[model samples]
Target: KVFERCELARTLKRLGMDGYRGISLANWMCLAKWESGYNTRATNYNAGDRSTDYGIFQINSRAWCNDGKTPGAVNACHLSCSALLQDNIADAVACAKRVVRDPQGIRAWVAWRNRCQNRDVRQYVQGCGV
Candidate 1:
């Protein structure tokens, strides 16, 4: 669902989704804000790479979804690319978990490493009982 950053954070915290395989809720919270502005319908086209990052988590079609046109696409998540872009966040979270299982972990999100790494985003979940 479309949510404010704090709204999403509270839901995640209640679900105990924080610290997924070591990635903090803070990072995830902040990453979502930066990557998609907490918008589930968010779809970004990167002209540089001719790629699209989708959903609140901005799951990349290149490696996570079956885009059909991306050569040698891994599609590790084995899902329809459009599925991740919809408001059904379960699929997005599931796919993001798969991405975290990789070597890079939260670093899979460029906004996380560039904006959240070496940083503590506790405020992202602060005052939300998160």
Candidate 2:
């Protein structure tokens, strides 16, 4: 599913992403926009570590979720990478919550740091009525 910007903002807000772990809904919107363009099936394979980033938020296989193919990886999310690709986004949301529990917070996503961090991210959700 390639969600429209406002559509995704509202959805994420409904999922309690607005202030989950101190991250704002607009920040989540910025992350999704930059990371996956709101596509549920988005994926990126990293040959450097033999791991992959999956789904809308680009949760990684090296530590967050398992693909059974990433060498030396751990399943911190306790779910298959396939789960992150689902349109429902429930599992992906759960894993994202777990990720920010780390000290890095939203900084865990490099894209967010480069594109969303300290920027006018509110635009991502400005007119979404979220």
Candidate 3:
């Protein structure tokens, strides 16, 4: 979903994503920015492992989900990763919550570990009226 920053923020808030799956909207905003600039079509293929990441959240095919285009994928979310590249990101959000329930939790998101983990991200939703 090619949303304006504030638009995404409000949607996230409406969905109660701020604390869903043990994640905060503030953290999700920073993660989305670094992963895909909020572009739903965002994708990346890593030649080193022949794995792919998909959508705004860059959910990894290696252990997260499958689009059937990537080999050796885990398909843990039991949905096509390609589905994540849609304007309706309900599935993606649900799947992300699944990831958060795992042992690694939100830290599985590289953006979260490298950026959001140590930062005070409350400002990401400061004025969104969420």
Candidate 4:
């Protein structure tokens, strides 16, 4: 499922991402824009690390979700990577929340630094009625 910008904003807000860990909804939207373009099934394998990034948030198998393929990986989210690929985002959102619980918070996503961090991200959720 590839969500429209406003649709995704409203969805994330409903899931409590608006201010989770002090990260704003627009920042989360911006992170998703870069990471997966709002597509639920988006995936990227990091061959160098033998891990993969899964779903809209691109939660990685190396330290978060489990795929049973990432060497020496941990499942801090205690979820299968498949869960992140679903059109239903509840599990993905939950895992993402767990990720930000770390000291680095939203910095856990490198895409946020490259594209969203310190930038005006309000455009991502503009007119979404969030």
Put down candidate 1 lDDT per residue, 59-114, tens digits, no spaces.
88789987676655788999988897777587788888899898988887878878
- Winner by lDDT: 4
Indicate which candidate wins on TM-score: 4
**Pairs of residues at least 3 apart in sequence or in different chains that clash in candidate 3:** none
Q: Rate the local accuracy (lDDT) of all candidates.
A: 0.82, 0.92, 0.83, 0.93
Q: For residues 33-121, could you state the per-residue lDDT of candidate 2 as single tens digits?
A: 99999999999999888999999999999899999999989899899999999999988999999999999999999999999888888
For model 3, the run of ten residues with the poorest summed lDDT: 14-23
How well is each residue in 30-107 modelled by candidate 4, as lDDT tens digits? Answer: 999999999999999888988999999999998999999899888999999999999999999999999999999999
Model 1 residue 119 distance off true place after TM-score fit, in angstroms: 1.6
Compared with the true structure, model 2 gives a TM-score of: 0.97
Ranking by lDDT: 4, 2, 3, 1
Residues 1-130, candidate 3: write the lDDT tens digits.
5877888899877777888766778888888888889898998999988888898889999788886767787888998887888998787788877788898888888778887888888877777777
Q: Between the candidate structures 3 and 4, which one is better when assessed by TM-score?
A: 4
Cand. 3 TM to true fold: 0.91
Ranking by TM-score: 4, 2, 3, 1
Candidate 4 accuracy as lDDT? 0.93
